[PDB]
Design an enzyme around this catalytic site. Structure first.
Site, PDB file in Angstrom:
ATOM      1  N   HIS A  61       0.840  -1.213   0.000  1.00 22.94           N
ATOM      2  CA  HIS A  61       0.000   0.000   0.000  1.00 22.94           C
ATOM      3  C   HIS A  61       0.867   1.253   0.000  1.00 22.94           C
ATOM      4  O   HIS A  61       0.563   2.217  -0.702  1.00 22.94           O
ATOM      5  CB  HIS A  61      -0.939   0.016   1.213  1.00 22.94           C
ATOM      6  CG  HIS A  61      -1.886  -1.140   1.248  1.00 22.94           C
ATOM      7  ND1 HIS A  61      -2.992  -1.211   0.434  1.00 22.94           N
ATOM      8  CD2 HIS A  61      -1.895  -2.261   2.004  1.00 22.94           C
ATOM      9  CE1 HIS A  61      -3.642  -2.336   0.680  1.00 22.94           C
ATOM     10  NE2 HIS A  61      -3.003  -2.987   1.631  1.00 22.94           N
ATOM     11  N   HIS A  91       5.558   6.925   6.818  1.00 21.84           N
ATOM     12  CA  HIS A  91       5.285   6.513   5.437  1.00 21.84           C
ATOM     13  C   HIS A  91       4.716   7.714   4.739  1.00 21.84           C
ATOM     14  O   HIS A  91       4.476   8.747   5.356  1.00 21.84           O
ATOM     15  CB  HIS A  91       4.239   5.383   5.394  1.00 21.84           C
ATOM     16  CG  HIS A  91       2.950   5.793   6.021  1.00 21.84           C
ATOM     17  ND1 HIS A  91       2.739   5.699   7.380  1.00 21.84           N
ATOM     18  CD2 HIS A  91       1.842   6.367   5.498  1.00 21.84           C
ATOM     19  CE1 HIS A  91       1.544   6.189   7.664  1.00 21.84           C
ATOM     20  NE2 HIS A  91       0.981   6.607   6.534  1.00 21.84           N
ATOM     21  N   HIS A  93       1.938   9.137   1.381  1.00 24.63           N
ATOM     22  CA  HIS A  93       0.896   8.958   0.377  1.00 24.63           C
ATOM     23  C   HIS A  93       1.256   9.879  -0.778  1.00 24.63           C
ATOM     24  O   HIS A  93       1.698  11.012  -0.537  1.00 24.63           O
ATOM     25  CB  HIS A  93      -0.501   9.281   0.933  1.00 24.63           C
ATOM     26  CG  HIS A  93      -0.837   8.551   2.190  1.00 24.63           C
ATOM     27  ND1 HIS A  93      -1.622   7.417   2.212  1.00 24.63           N
ATOM     28  CD2 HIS A  93      -0.441   8.762   3.466  1.00 24.63           C
ATOM     29  CE1 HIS A  93      -1.744   6.999   3.465  1.00 24.63           C
ATOM     30  NE2 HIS A  93      -1.015   7.777   4.241  1.00 24.63           N
ATOM     31  N   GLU A 103      -3.435  13.618   1.295  1.00 23.76           N
ATOM     32  CA  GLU A 103      -4.695  13.163   1.899  1.00 23.76           C
ATOM     33  C   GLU A 103      -5.432  14.359   2.488  1.00 23.76           C
ATOM     34  O   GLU A 103      -6.540  14.679   2.053  1.00 23.76           O
ATOM     35  CB  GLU A 103      -4.385  12.128   2.973  1.00 23.76           C
ATOM     36  CG  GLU A 103      -3.821  10.878   2.329  1.00 23.76           C
ATOM     37  CD  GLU A 103      -4.051   9.639   3.126  1.00 23.76           C
ATOM     38  OE1 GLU A 103      -3.695   9.591   4.328  1.00 23.76           O
ATOM     39  OE2 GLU A 103      -4.532   8.655   2.543  1.00 23.76           O
ATOM     40  N   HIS A 116       3.476  10.963   6.792  1.00 19.37           N
ATOM     41  CA  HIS A 116       2.845  10.691   8.084  1.00 19.37           C
ATOM     42  C   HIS A 116       3.857  10.056   9.012  1.00 19.37           C
ATOM     43  O   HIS A 116       4.342   8.951   8.754  1.00 19.37           O
ATOM     44  CB  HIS A 116       1.676   9.727   7.881  1.00 19.37           C
ATOM     45  CG  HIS A 116       0.514  10.389   7.203  1.00 19.37           C
ATOM     46  ND1 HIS A 116      -0.523   9.698   6.607  1.00 19.37           N
ATOM     47  CD2 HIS A 116       0.240  11.707   7.041  1.00 19.37           C
ATOM     48  CE1 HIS A 116      -1.379  10.562   6.101  1.00 19.37           C
ATOM     49  NE2 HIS A 116      -0.949  11.788   6.358  1.00 19.37           N
ATOM     50  N   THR A 195      -6.195   6.775   8.170  1.00 20.28           N
ATOM     51  CA  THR A 195      -6.703   7.030   6.828  1.00 20.28           C
ATOM     52  C   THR A 195      -6.680   5.800   5.950  1.00 20.28           C
ATOM     53  O   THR A 195      -7.062   5.904   4.787  1.00 20.28           O
ATOM     54  CB  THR A 195      -5.888   8.110   6.114  1.00 20.28           C
ATOM     55  OG1 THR A 195      -4.560   7.626   5.862  1.00 20.28           O
ATOM     56  CG2 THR A 195      -5.845   9.406   6.953  1.00 20.28           C
TER      57      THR A 195
END
Ligand SMILES: Cc1ccc2c(n1)SCc1cnn(-c3ccc(S(N)(=O)=O)cc3)c1-2
Ligand SMILES: [Zn+2]
Length: 257
Positions: A61, A91, A93, A103, A116, A195
């Site tokens: 992911h 990590h 996004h 996000e 994050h 999230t």
């Protein structure tokens, strides 16, 4: 299983995780004009000098850089928080295009990516217990825009070829997360959630106002990662972000005027 595709993406998550439609879901849009300065908030304390990174993992992911959280080595305190929160992993996004990927959004603006840094409240003893509590986690969110390179990010970028596919990990010791921070620790804060599934409502979100800049080459390397495992058809790891969720009965507070 859940993911970020048409058939298993964010609009589907609620079927396995009904809390997806809950009262304090994240991310959200930060409307800067409606956020209110809270003069009682304290400066954040980010104490990362003794941080002990261990490993980097492609989990299908995103990728996680993991830390030793068996002692108070890298902790977040102050701000809206009471008590001490230990860094467990960070990590990102990110998007398929520079115009999307974050996000949280700021007055509906999407950044290229979002970092994050995940911390858990030591009063709960372990991360698994912490996620079951309304004040269990504190996630420090930092926006990425494309421009100049971020030198402190490069060691992360350069190991990505070794964890291209799901389930791959590599040693990643002696990484200093202080190199990923912007100059200012001005922030917005609100109560929210993980999230990704399980979408638990256990997070105090602390989102920094100042983005960091990364280079086009740095983010291009993020986009060469794979969601798939080795020996499976290639699915590029891009657009691994959940869109903004309804604010509902929440107020976003600002640490700054
Ligand atoms: C694949 C994947 C990733 C993460 C998780 C899981 N699976 S399942 C178990 C678990 C518990 N928390 N948590 C987590 C989820 C989201 C964020 S974020 N994005 O910072 O709100 C931080 C931590 C995960
Ligand atoms: Zn995240």
């Amino acid at each position: 299983h859940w993911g970020y595709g048409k058939h298993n993406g964010p609009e589907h998550w609620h079927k396995d995780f009904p809390i997806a439609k809950g009262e304090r879901q994240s991310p959200v849009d930060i409307d800067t004009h409606t956020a209110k300065y809270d003069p009682s908030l304290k400066p954040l304390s980010v104490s990362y000098d003794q941080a002990t990174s261990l490993r980097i993992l492609n989990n299908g992911h995103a990728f996680n850089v993991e830390f030793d959280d068996s002692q108070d080595k890298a902790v977040l305190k102050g701000g809206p928080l009471d008590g001490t929160y230990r860094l467990i992993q960070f990590h990102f996004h990110w998007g398929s295009l520079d115009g999307q990927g974050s996000e949280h959004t700021v007055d509906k603006k999407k950044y290229a990516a979002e970092l994050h840094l995940v911390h858990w409240n030591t009063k709960y003893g372990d991360f698994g217990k912490a996620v079951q509590q309304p004040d269990g986690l504190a996630v420090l969110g930092i926006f990425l825009k494309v421009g100049s390179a971020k030198p402190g990010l490069q060691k992360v970028v350069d190991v990505l070829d070794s964890i291209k596919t799901k389930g791959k990990s590599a040693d990643f010791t002696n990484f200093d997360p202080r190199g990923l921070l912007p100059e200012s620790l001005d922030y917005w804060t609100y109560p929210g959630s993980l999230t990704t599934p399980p979408l638990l409502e256990c997070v105090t979100w602390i989102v920094l106002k100042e983005p960091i800049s990364v280079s086009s080459e740095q983010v291009l390397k993020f986009r060469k990662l794979n969601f798939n495992g080795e020996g499976e058809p290639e699915e590029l790891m891009v657009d691994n972000w959940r869109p903004a969720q309804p604010l509902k009965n929440r107020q976003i507070k600002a640490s700054f005027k």
